[PDB]
Amino acid sequence: PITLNDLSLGKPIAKGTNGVVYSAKVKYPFALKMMFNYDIQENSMEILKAMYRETVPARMYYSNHDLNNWEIELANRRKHLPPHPNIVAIFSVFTDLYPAANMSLFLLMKRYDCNLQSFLSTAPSTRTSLLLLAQLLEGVAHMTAHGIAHRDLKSDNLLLDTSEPESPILVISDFGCCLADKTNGLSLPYTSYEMDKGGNTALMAPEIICQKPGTFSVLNYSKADLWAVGAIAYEIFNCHNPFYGPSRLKNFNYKEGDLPKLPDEVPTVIQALVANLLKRNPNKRLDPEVAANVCQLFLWAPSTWLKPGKVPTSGEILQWLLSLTTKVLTYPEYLLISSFLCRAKLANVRNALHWIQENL
Amino acid sequence: PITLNDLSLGKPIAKGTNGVVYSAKVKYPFALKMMFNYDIQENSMEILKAMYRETVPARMYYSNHDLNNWEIELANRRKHLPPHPNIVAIFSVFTDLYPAANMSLFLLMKRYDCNLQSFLSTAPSTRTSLLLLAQLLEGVAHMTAHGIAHRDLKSDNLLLDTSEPESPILVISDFGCCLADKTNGLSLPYTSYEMDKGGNTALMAPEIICQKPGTFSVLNYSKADLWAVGAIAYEIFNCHNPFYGPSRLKNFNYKEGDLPKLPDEVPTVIQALVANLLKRNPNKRLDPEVAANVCQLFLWAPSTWLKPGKVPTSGEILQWLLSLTTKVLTYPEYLLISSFLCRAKLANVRNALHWIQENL
Amino acid sequence: PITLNDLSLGKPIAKGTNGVVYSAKVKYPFALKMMFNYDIQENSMEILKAMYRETVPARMYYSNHDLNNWEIELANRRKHLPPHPNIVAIFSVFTDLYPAANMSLFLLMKRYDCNLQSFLSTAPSTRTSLLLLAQLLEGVAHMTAHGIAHRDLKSDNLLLDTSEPESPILVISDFGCCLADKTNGLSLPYTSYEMDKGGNTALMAPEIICQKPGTFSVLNYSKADLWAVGAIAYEIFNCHNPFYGPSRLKNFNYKEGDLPKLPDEVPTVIQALVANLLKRNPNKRLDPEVAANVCQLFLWAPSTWLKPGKVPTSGEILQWLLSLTTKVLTYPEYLLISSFLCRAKLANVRNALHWIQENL
Ligand SMILES: [Mg+2]
Ligand SMILES: [Mg+2]
Ligand SMILES: [Mg+2]
């Protein structure tokens, strides 16, 4: 594992009362985030959990000292998120003192070029926007498959690699508000109103903000990130996020008719996908796995599958998947497809095909 | 760094829908400007950038919370303006809630006595006017040297310290419209017509207002504040700003013959400087570094340098600069001279000498 | 707050070089006055102060842009006039561009049916005239109570709602000459002769016109609207305004014997009030609060209070006030009484009683 001794720091990227991010390299394409006071004596469990959660995507842990019982319990209760092109790259996590220049938690990450809101200050291609949506959906599908909910998706913390600015790579980052417990997965008992519910923010899903507490009384997050993707899809196709601003829809009120129409540039099928995602009732919304397939099928299927027409065969699908595997053996395009093939199960690709047919 | 806890508020100085300014002190010579809704959820990026830009002259930043990515990207993309006597003193910037009596941006500043248009409600000395012009020029020279353009210079936001009312201290304030980006400096790609171009106002320079958009198609701001100084110099010598009023010259139209002649009370050399600054073509206008020098030389050079006569020697110039440093080791007079010595490069003081000789 | 987006224009009511008034409605009972060139760059402060003053009765302010320093200085020096039935209803004031069809000032007001001079083109009932006079007085008592002087009261800008033409509602309008400063209230330093003194017009009170300038040398406006009311009372009871016409008394000369006698139709008590109001010396004039009570007592007191007789008791007064409060729980009649009860203090209702007794 990489620790401090293997790397050289540069200029600060950000400084704060609660921590610092430094540029870094091995001997400046890395960022080393340091969160101070990772110590049960200097902070309560709520804050330590939040610091640890940031570590949910991490590739390796390293520890100098004997782990404290609270550290142990945190680790043993946590679902791990495997690597994925659309999830932030966190290469190492270690604990360490403020020598080597407060017990401090350290995270070594890839440096990204900008966030999504910055990249959208200039309107991208309509094709670029579909790739962005596709990657965002693919990241959400990967989290949900592994019983994790981000709970704080927003423009601000989707991070981009803008080599080839016509098609960037998008990653989900900042897992400090995430749900990742082995015990309860994506369903969370909600008994007191003063309980951690994710980011108490604009893009919390209606099924989370609206829920009243009680005795199970559960909060279900299995489609909650998807709702926020819907909002975010607006920003991705050049419009205001309907739920941001001074004249501003709210997750708990909004009637589905209040939602602005999307520009005519953005395909009809995709408009429907966005409208699906933004359904208040989670039962009415697509599975993440299926919603991701919709975007991929739009991007890569035979055109006959997309036009009303249409004979779809189980054997023909598998042939088409294999044509795709050979096609990748335009770096984003490769990533999406491999990402798509990694999870393609025959059932769900038909579900997505059937959904597309019904929306024309 | 100073935060709210260290200071005590008094009467409001200004009250508005978008923010409030309060008189303040440490334990009422400070002003604490508060701008509401410094939140990506309650306002769009263009408004937030405009709030942050106001911060460009700040001496210290302090943050309670962990910086959001937009805040980080803003901070890292921004050119900083070092302290300077003719630039507004902003001692602290901090982010904070509307308690402590909306996430609000806060600016702790010096309180100044009035603006330039109020001070010029009674005609000042002709000597006072030259000190005013020198200070303004010296401020613009400092901005331009650091790749920053104010874009909204005007009587209304030039602020004065009127202890010793025969000679006040002038400062440039209200950096809300400024250009201060590390990436592009003073050259700004102008691709869409619906783009922030600075204050879309009377004293935008001809080279900015007249430029049509395209594909680079660049806006060059490197002499644009200087044009505004020219217009403002009229107000400073007791005339109407040629570009203000109902019967009014317009930056885009005006031909150089349309400009009113200045009063005979204003030295001939200074009349020419003003006529230079107000040239339509930025290539015909002096560098800021040179234009500031013209005013300084008028003020402090040996009289032989100013009369037609005149042997000027590289060694003699340096001797004269060193005579000045000793002379400052009438507080405005000290500040201007030290301001001038700080930036004096030998090339530019000769250029300024040569320019004065050619205009008599 | 209401802005342009909330309302739909109709026909112009008036057009000019300096601005426009449009009929308007929310989705034509409103008027939207627009004054152009509300910009320090297109007009001098004098003209802006006069545009801003028009806004003194306004119920809400709204500003799209960051307020300029001259705007700020205006707002913070200005006394606000709370709503009142006899003061023009201005629902919103906002600043905006001349697009959306010049920075322009916008005032959204109630439409009224006519002015006083038009309404008096046919002689009204002697009872109608007392209601008019009472409302006028009530408006003045409200202004003086909040340290504001209109300084341009005249038939031309008293505006009427003429539903139930037997009894109309009168409002004082057009506050563009008014004195409304926090600093000095109704006493105004008068150091130069070229100083804004209100409408420099026929109904300026003798104490204002006759005052020579100096070093305090103060103009006292506390009984000055009252004087104009006196003149206007003639118009209200079917006579020529003594101070209007080609054969014409002047506010600086007129001897109190020169005032025409009022018609025998107008009560003797009311003749005396008018004569009191038109006394040259403001110290011999009734307080506005008392003068307004005189008219009210005439209209609503027990008849025994008005005839020479008369036992008046502090407890009995209060009982009578409460009898009035019940009587209002003929819409003008309601308004007058509520207006009178809102301000009735026991001291001043006895002062008025006492004054009525001494004038028979
Ligand atoms: Mg041990
Ligand atoms: Mg966090
Ligand atoms: Mg501003």
Residue numbers in the entry:
A (entry chain E), B (entry chain D), C (entry chain F): 156 to 182, 191 to 260, 271 to 274, 287 to 494, 496 to 515, 536 to 566
Cite, word for word, the article reporting this structure.
Autosomal recessive inherited loss-of-function mutations in human PTEN-induced kinase 1 (hPINK1), represent the second most frequent cause of early-onset Parkinson’s disease (PD). hPINK1 has been proposed to act as a master regulator of mitochondrial quality control, promoting the elimination of damaged mitochondria via autophagy known as mitophagy. In response to mitochondrial depolarisation, hPINK1 is activated and phosphorylates ubiquitin at Serine65 (Ser65). The molecular mechanisms of hPINK1 activation and substrate recognition are poorly understood. hPINK1 is distinct from other protein kinases due to the presence of three unique insertions (Ins1, Ins2 and Ins3) within the kinase domain and a C-terminal extension (CTE) of unknown function that bears no homology to any known protein domain. TcPINK1 exhibits constitutive catalytic activity towards ubiquitin, Parkin and generic substrates in vitro.
The crystal structure of a catalytically active fragment of TcPINK1 was solved and refined to 2.78 Å using E. coli expression of a cDNA construct encompassing the kinase domain and CTE (Ser150 - Asp570), and possessing mutations to reduce surface entropy (Glu527Ala and Lys528Ala), a 10 amino acid deletion in a large loop (Δ261–270), and a phospho-mimetic mutation (Ser205Glu). The N-lobe of the TcPINK1 kinase domain contains three insertions: Lys182–Pro192 (Ins1), Glu221–Ala253 (Ins2), and Leu260–Met288 (Ins3) and in contrast to hPINK1, Ins1 exists as a loop remnant in TcPINK1. Ins2 forms a small domain containing a βi-strand (222-226) and an αi-helix (231-242) followed by a loop (243-253). Ins3 is disordered and is not included in the final model. Finally, the majority of the TcPINK1 CTE (Ala487–Leu556) is α-helical in nature, and rather than forming a separate domain, is tightly packed on the E, G and H α-helices of the C-lobe of the kinase domain (3747 Å2 buried surface area), supporting previous data on the importance of this region for catalysis. Although TcPINK1 was crystallised without ATP, the kinase domain appears to adopt an active, closed conformation, based on the positioning of the αC helix, activation segment conformation, and the ‘in’ position of the DFG motif. Ser207 phosphorylation was also observed in the crystal structure. Inspection of the structure revealed that Glu205 (the phosphomimetic of Ser205) lies only 4 Å away from the tail (Asn287) of the disordered Ins3. Instead the TcPINK1 structure reveals that a highly conserved aspartate (Asp381) within the activation loop, an arginine residue (Arg336) of the HRD motif and an arginine residue (Arg216) in the αC-helix, form an equivalent interaction, which is further stabilized via interaction with basic residues (Lys212 on the αC-helix; Arg240 and Arg241 in Ins2) and another conserved aspartate (Asp366).
